[PDB]
Amino acid sequence: QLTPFLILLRKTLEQLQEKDTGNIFSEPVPLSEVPDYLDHIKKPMDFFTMKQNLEAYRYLNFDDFEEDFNLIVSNCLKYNAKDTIFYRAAVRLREQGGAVLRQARRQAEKM
């Protein structure tokens, strides 16, 4: 059965994906194209992996959800040079996504 909290996480995940207009963060960074990625990044994350986590009841709280979103952004800032589309997109996502999360955390607190 559905819970209000899990419904809120689903809603919030959709709102975050809407902010990623180019679908830069929809799926894992492809190791075939970026063969040194795991040399630098210890815990890859992306929205499809978050959707999998959400549906396996691994976000028992909001914190753990926000932490995975923040990894999407921090991994991208860490890996990519500043003068890239990826780095700029992660800065934009940090800005827009942070605002989605702040509002969503307020709703979570009422539960």
Ligand SMILES: CCc1ccc(S(=O)(=O)Nc2cc3c(cc2OC)n(C)c(=O)n3C)cc1
């Ligand atoms: C902007 C043109 C471009 C898109 C995808 C690629 S990719 O085939 O290398 N895929 C890819 C790489 C990513 C990436 C996302 C990618 O596919 C969308 N992110 C978030 C990231 O940090 N890296 C290094 C390369 C260039």
